[PDB]
Amino acid sequence: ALTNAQILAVIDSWEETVGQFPVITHHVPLGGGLQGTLHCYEIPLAAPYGVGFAKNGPTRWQYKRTINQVVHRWGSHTVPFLLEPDNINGKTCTASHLCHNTRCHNPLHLCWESLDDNKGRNWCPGPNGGCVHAVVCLRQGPLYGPGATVAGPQQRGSHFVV
Amino acid sequence: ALTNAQILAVIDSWEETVGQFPVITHHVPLGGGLQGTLHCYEIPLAAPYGVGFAKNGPTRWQYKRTINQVVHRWGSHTVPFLLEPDNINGKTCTASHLCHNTRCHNPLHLCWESLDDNKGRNWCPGPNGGCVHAVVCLRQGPLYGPGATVAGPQQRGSHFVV
Numbered sequence: 001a002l003t004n005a006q007i008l009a010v011i012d013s014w015e016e017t018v019g020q021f022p023v024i025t026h027h028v029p030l031g032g033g034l035q036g037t038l039h040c041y042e043i044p045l046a047a048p049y050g051v052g053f054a055k056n057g058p059t060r061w062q063y064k065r066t067i068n069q070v071v072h073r074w075g076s077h078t079v080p081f082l083l084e085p086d087n088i089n090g091k092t093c094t095a096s097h098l099c100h101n102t103r104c105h106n107p108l109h110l111c112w113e114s115l116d117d118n119k120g121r122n123w124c125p126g127p128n129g130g131c132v133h134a135v136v137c138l139r140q141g142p143l144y145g146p147g148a149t150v151a152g153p154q155q156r157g158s159h160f161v162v
Numbered sequence: 163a164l165t166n167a168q169i170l171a172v173i174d175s176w177e178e179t180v181g182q183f184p185v186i187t188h189h190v191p192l193g194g195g196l197q198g199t200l201h202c203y204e205i206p207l208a209a210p211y212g213v214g215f216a217k218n219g220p221t222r223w224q225y226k227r228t229i230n231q232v233v234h235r236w237g238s239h240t241v242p243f244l245l246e247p248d249n250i251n252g253k254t255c256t257a258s259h260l261c262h263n264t265r266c267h268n269p270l271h272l273c274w275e276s277l278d279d280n281k282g283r284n285w286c287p288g289p290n291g292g293c294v295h296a297v298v299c300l301r302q303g304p305l306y307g308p309g310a311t312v313a314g315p316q317q318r319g320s321h322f323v324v
């Protein structure tokens with residue numbers, strides 16, 4: 001439908017609008033006890049969201065542009081990757097938040113990968129704690145740690161061996 | 163509300179029956195380039211599954227016992243933890259497979275924890291690769307690794323900073 005050149009124009013106007021989103025500066029764990037700073041550019045909570053942006057459900061938004069009378073819509077976080085393959089290993093690529101902040105649309109905080117890869121960064125030790133993700137994590141995952149397991153492997157008799 | 167004695171009887175009968183489940187030896191990644199050996203006790207693919215066991219949907223089974231003239235049913239993997247709280251402050255406890263093998267019912271391969279703790283093990287480096295789970299993993303998670311990220315963080319202009 002859209003040529004690569006038209007797509008580039010879409011990504012550029014998207015970057016300009018997102019660049020005006022209010023910035024939140026916060027400190028995050030990088031792994032191994034090291035602290036770092038991130039600058040998230042967050043989409044407003046209420047209209048005005050910025051030209052082309054609109055809510056798309058509970059906590060999702062989409063970017064919409066009408067080109068040559070045809071209406072085009074994209075998930076709000078996906079625009080930076082419109083020229084990239086949209087699947088890998090047979091899995092649909094998703095806009096993954098390295099900052100783990102849903103409202104953030106900073107392209108420096110997003111990557112394009114499968115939902116599984118996306119989900120996993122959540123338990124990742126971080127760039128400074130052992131992260132082995134080829135496209136390195138920006139911070140330690142929010143869910144990383146010992147867990148809260150209430151009961152471990154056990155047996156009353158002697159029927160089993162590990 | 164079964165007495166403590168009745169519950170012990172349920173676990174004991176469960177253990178004896180699962181103990182007669184065919185034992186499959188799997189060699190799995192431990193992390194750190196090392197491999198280990200696990201003995202999974204797998205529930206048959208079709209009837210007969212074993213005394214007290216029945217299919218409860220796809221890839222799910224139930225264990226039933228008649229106590230005081232009443233049939234009781236539990237998820238086939240939950241029996242080892244019948245004496246433990248079923249939730250911590252509302253957070254539902256789940257039978258988590260440390261061996262990541264659904265058909266396996268080896269109690270030495272199961273732990274009792276929340277869905278999040280359960281999910282996170284999917285990406286753990288393993289017991290020899292840096293696992294930090296309080297209740298240590300028996301192996302490296304199936305999804306652990308560099309991942310397959312199509313595109314990483316990047317911006318075209320200079321509207322953003324990390």
Ligand SMILES: [Zn+2]
Nearest residue numbers: 040099104109
């Ligand atoms: Zn961010």
Ligand SMILES: [Zn+2]
Nearest residue numbers: 124131133137
């Ligand atoms: Zn990582």
Ligand SMILES: [Zn+2]
Nearest residue numbers: 202261266271
């Ligand atoms: Zn097993």
Ligand SMILES: [Zn+2]
Nearest residue numbers: 286293295299
């Ligand atoms: Zn672990």
